[PDB]
Design an enzyme around this catalytic site. Structure first.
Site, PDB file in Angstrom:
ATOM      1  N   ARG A   1       1.053   8.835  13.012  1.00 40.30           N
ATOM      2  CA  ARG A   1       0.725  10.011  13.796  1.00 40.30           C
ATOM      3  C   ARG A   1      -0.770  10.311  13.695  1.00 40.30           C
ATOM      4  NH1 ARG A   1       2.434  15.348  12.968  1.00 40.30           N
ATOM      5  NH2 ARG A   1       1.748  15.118  10.779  1.00 40.30           N
TER       6      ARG A   1
ATOM      7  N   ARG B   1     -11.370   5.994   8.745  1.00 40.01           N
ATOM      8  CA  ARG B   1     -10.329   5.357   7.957  1.00 40.01           C
ATOM      9  C   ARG B   1      -9.431   4.502   8.851  1.00 40.01           C
ATOM     10  NH1 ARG B   1     -10.666  10.424   6.942  1.00 40.01           N
ATOM     11  NH2 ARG B   1      -8.712  10.976   7.991  1.00 40.01           N
TER      12      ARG B   1
ATOM     13  N   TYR C   1       0.818  -1.217   0.000  1.00 35.04           N
ATOM     14  CA  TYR C   1       0.000   0.000   0.000  1.00 35.04           C
ATOM     15  C   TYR C   1       0.860   1.281   0.000  1.00 35.04           C
ATOM     16  CZ  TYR C   1      -3.095   3.745   1.400  1.00 35.04           C
ATOM     17  OH  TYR C   1      -3.755   4.934   1.442  1.00 35.04           O
TER      18      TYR C   1
ATOM     19  N   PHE D   1      15.373  19.867  -0.771  1.00 33.79           N
ATOM     20  CA  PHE D   1      14.053  19.319  -1.078  1.00 33.79           C
ATOM     21  C   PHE D   1      13.854  17.920  -0.486  1.00 33.79           C
ATOM     22  CE2 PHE D   1      11.343  17.095  -4.405  1.00 33.79           C
ATOM     23  CZ  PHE D   1      10.134  17.604  -3.996  1.00 33.79           C
TER      24      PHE D   1
HETATM   25  C1  LIG Z   1       8.030  10.807  -1.324  1.00 31.36           C
HETATM   26  O1  LIG Z   1       7.884  12.185  -1.004  1.00 31.36           O
HETATM   27  C2  LIG Z   1       8.952  13.054  -1.213  1.00 31.36           C
HETATM   28  C3  LIG Z   1      10.262  12.704  -1.597  1.00 31.36           C
HETATM   29  C4  LIG Z   1      11.280  13.711  -1.741  1.00 31.36           C
HETATM   30  C5  LIG Z   1      10.926  15.071  -1.565  1.00 31.36           C
HETATM   31  C6  LIG Z   1       9.609  15.409  -1.176  1.00 31.36           C
HETATM   32  C7  LIG Z   1       8.636  14.403  -1.012  1.00 31.36           C
HETATM   33  C8  LIG Z   1       7.212  14.735  -0.559  1.00 31.36           C
HETATM   34  O2  LIG Z   1       7.174  16.057  -0.050  1.00 31.36           O
HETATM   35  C9  LIG Z   1       7.545  16.397   1.275  1.00 31.36           C
HETATM   36  C10 LIG Z   1       6.431  16.156   2.262  1.00 31.36           C
HETATM   37  N1  LIG Z   1       5.449  17.233   2.242  1.00 31.36           N
HETATM   38  C11 LIG Z   1       5.594  18.330   3.248  1.00 31.36           C
HETATM   39  C12 LIG Z   1       7.042  18.782   3.561  1.00 31.36           C
HETATM   40  C13 LIG Z   1       7.205  19.867   4.667  1.00 31.36           C
HETATM   41  C14 LIG Z   1       6.467  19.434   5.935  1.00 31.36           C
HETATM   42  C15 LIG Z   1       5.007  19.150   5.561  1.00 31.36           C
HETATM   43  C16 LIG Z   1       4.222  18.876   6.834  1.00 31.36           C
HETATM   44  O3  LIG Z   1       3.026  18.762   6.855  1.00 31.36           O
HETATM   45  O4  LIG Z   1       4.996  18.793   7.927  1.00 31.36           O
HETATM   46  C17 LIG Z   1       4.787  18.006   4.522  1.00 31.36           C
HETATM   47  C18 LIG Z   1       4.477  17.407   1.335  1.00 31.36           C
HETATM   48  O5  LIG Z   1       3.755  18.403   1.501  1.00 31.36           O
HETATM   49  C19 LIG Z   1       4.118  16.488   0.158  1.00 31.36           C
HETATM   50  C20 LIG Z   1       3.966  15.042   0.679  1.00 31.36           C
HETATM   51  O6  LIG Z   1       3.538  14.843   1.809  1.00 31.36           O
HETATM   52  N2  LIG Z   1       4.411  14.021  -0.118  1.00 31.36           N
HETATM   53  C21 LIG Z   1       4.727  12.683   0.493  1.00 31.36           C
HETATM   54  C22 LIG Z   1       3.641  11.587   0.296  1.00 31.36           C
HETATM   55  C23 LIG Z   1       3.597  11.061  -1.152  1.00 31.36           C
HETATM   56  C24 LIG Z   1       4.028  10.432   1.245  1.00 31.36           C
HETATM   57  C25 LIG Z   1       2.260  12.163   0.616  1.00 31.36           C
HETATM   58  C26 LIG Z   1       4.837  14.442  -1.397  1.00 31.36           C
HETATM   59  C27 LIG Z   1       3.874  14.498  -2.439  1.00 31.36           C
HETATM   60  C28 LIG Z   1       4.219  14.895  -3.750  1.00 31.36           C
HETATM   61  C29 LIG Z   1       5.535  15.274  -3.983  1.00 31.36           C
HETATM   62 CL1  LIG Z   1       6.006  15.803  -5.564  1.00 31.36          CL
HETATM   63  C30 LIG Z   1       6.504  15.183  -2.967  1.00 31.36           C
HETATM   64  C31 LIG Z   1       6.161  14.757  -1.664  1.00 31.36           C
END
Ligand SMILES: COc1ccccc1[C@H]1OCCN([C@@H]2CCC[C@H](C(=O)O)C2)C(=O)CC(=O)N(CC(C)(C)C)c2ccc(Cl)cc21
EC number: 2.5.1.21
Length: 335
Positions: free
Chosen positions: A183, A193, A136, A253
């Site tokens: 969390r 969910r 998943y 990033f």
């Molecule tokens: C596999 O994910 C990464 C790999 C390498 C670099 C960045 C990411 C990630 O972004 C960072 C996480 N994030 C912020 C960062 C700052 C603190 C924020 C907070 O709420 O504390 C959360 C995000 O808003 C986006 C996000 O959550 N995802 C992860 C998922 C897919 C697990 C849902 C995400 C989605 C799309 C893209 Cl293009 C990137 C990302």
């Protein structure tokens, strides 16, 4: 910037809040390609998340989403979620997708195709085994890490290994996703969910909702500790992944989300509050982490500090205690 790209960045700021700046700092062609991929994934997630969309309609939407990127007029007007503007105005996002270089379009499209298949498969089930939990998480998060990695390599800002090593990339995504799942126990419960793996929680209580009742708080925290121990297993890969990045903007990033996830897990470890509300790190703590996480020595120092904190709080009678100590020891002695 075209008006359509400007609209995309507006949605990026609306959806990613203060993380938007980190994306906006990406070098060269990476900036637009990540912005668009971010928005497209937000659209896909919004379809997956929307419980008002029926299964018979949702399955085709998820399967065919990769195709919609190439359909100038495709949009979806029936969503009832927070980020529904990205679906209602999908034509603007898809136009900018189609303006990316083909090498970035093909990455995004392939990822969306595979994520859709996987999301469609889990509409009909809850996660049972830890192995199913990883499957998943691959579909909803690990594939995001893999896609981003391929953009980094395809842009030539990073070595091809970054894009090819799917397992390290997958671990980047799984670490964030499992941290969010852990969390968000209570918020998820309240939204109806269930993401904690049934094979783990079923060894403590009869129903997952039981962890919200006061009499089960000790059992709840044991399960929490066990799942946190699970998530920590990805940190060696995270370290390996980050240690390969040569571009500063890409480093920041990738590194910033990971250290914030580490600090979140440390806050959640052995913490009853997970079962009563949302445990979050303080804004000033977050800012410092974001400013500090810009080179490997500093990221490793942060990881080691939080892991030592967890280590010293492990209760002797915790059922996962020696597993927790073992993974912390592996992490410590790797770099
Ligand atoms: C596999 O994910 C990464 C790999 C390498 C670099 C960045 C990411 C990630 O972004 C960072 C996480 N994030 C912020 C960062 C700052 C603190 C924020 C907070 O709420 O504390 C959360 C995000 O808003 C986006 C996000 O959550 N995802 C992860 C998922 C897919 C697990 C849902 C995400 C989605 C799309 C893209 Cl293009 C990137 C990302």
């Amino acid at each position: 910037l075209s008006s359509s790209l400007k609209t995309c960045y507006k949605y990026l700021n609306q959806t990613s809040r203060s993380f938007a700046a980190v994306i906006q700092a990406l070098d060269g062609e990476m900036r637009n390609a990540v912005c668009i991929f971010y928005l497209v994934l937000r659209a896909l997630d919004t379809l997956e998340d929307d419980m008002t969309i029926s299964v018979e309609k949702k399955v085709p939407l998820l399967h065919n989403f990769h195709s919609f990127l190439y359909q100038p007029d495709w949009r979806f007007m029936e969503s009832k979620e927070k980020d529904r503007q990205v679906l209602e105005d999908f034509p603007t996002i898809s136009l900018e997708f189609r303006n990316l270089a083909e090498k970035y379009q093909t990455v995004i499209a392939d990822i969306c195709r595979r994520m859709g298949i996987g999301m469609a498969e889990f509409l009909d089930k809850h996660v049972t085994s830890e192995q199913e939990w990883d499957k998943y998480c691959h579909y909803v998060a690990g594939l995001v890490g893999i896609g981003l990695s391929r953009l980094f390599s395809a842009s030539e800002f990073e070595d091809p290994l970054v894009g090819e090593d799917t397992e390290r990339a997958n671990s980047m995504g799984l670490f964030l996703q499992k941290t969010n799942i852990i969390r968000d126990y209570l918020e998820d419960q309240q939204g109806g969910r269930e993401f904690w793996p049934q094979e783990v929680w079923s060894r403590y209580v009869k129903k997952l909702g039981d962890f919200a009742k006061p009499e089960n708080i000790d059992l709840a925290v044991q399960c929490l500790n066990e799942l946190i121990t699970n998530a920590l297993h990805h940190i060696p890969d995270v370290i390996t992944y980050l240690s390969r990045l040569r571009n500063q903007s890409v480093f920041n990033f990738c590194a910033i989300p990971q250290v914030m996830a580490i600090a979140t897990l440390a806050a959640c470890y052995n913490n009853q509050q997970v079962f009563k509300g949302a445990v979050k790190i303080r804004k000033g703590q977050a800012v410092t982490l974001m400013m500090d996480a810009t080179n490997m020595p500093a990221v490793k120092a942060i990881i080691y500090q939080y892991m030592e904190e967890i280590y010293h709080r492990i209760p002797d009678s915790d059922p996962s205690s020696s597993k927790t100590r073992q993974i912390i020891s592996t992490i410590r002695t790797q770099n």
